Amino acid sequence: ELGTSNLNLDARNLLAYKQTEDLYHQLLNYPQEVISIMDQTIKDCMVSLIVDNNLDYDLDEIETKFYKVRPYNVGSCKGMRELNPNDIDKLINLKGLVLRSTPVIPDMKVAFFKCNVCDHTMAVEIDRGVIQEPARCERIDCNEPNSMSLIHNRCSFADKQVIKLQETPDFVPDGQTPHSISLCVYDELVDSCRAGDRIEVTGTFRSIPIRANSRQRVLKSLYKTYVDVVHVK
């Protein structure tokens, strides 16, 4: 009725239903795939409701929408100092004070390519930040090779933002300098919190390699951590 898409889900409700105990544990252990199947199930049930109830509401509009779920309260919140390597790719809860937030970063979803001898364009999706650019036009008539250019302003982009978080005063054991962890928020969670706010963030504790230099492919053995946020309160 309101036209929104995001569904705020509470974890405990999964433990309330006999069927979904294993689903709850899997969410806590494999958040990415579980969230994906949750999103698709939400979209499928949304379309099925209209299909079964033969309502007058337009179906094309529903088919156009990306649907999402935002789990929260997934267990006792841990501490930034207690994040060990055992938690990499696992859902965690962090309570901390915002400290800064960078401007919106354009993150690429779909690349757009155009030929220089036939003016034929086709959009190729992206997987983990790599463009599968073609070696020749998909047109049979013009099969010229290595004649693809990237039209930067015709691609598709998504909203990304990097926030810095610092722990609450009560979590400091002695009074030393509080530590800092970096976050990443995408889509409707962008600009969801202002500097100096006390927020509780639920996300996946991820880790990414760092390149040694901007020329070669050598990576430092030390991995840098961050949090991929899915819900903010």
């Binding site: 001898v117 036939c118 003016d119 008539d141 013009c142």
Partner: peptide, 12 residues
């Protein structure tokens, strides 16, 4: 003594 290939705009 040249191997030349031609492209046409009408094919666009």
């Amino acid at each position: 003594s040249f191997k030349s290939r031609a492209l046409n705009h009408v094919k666009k």
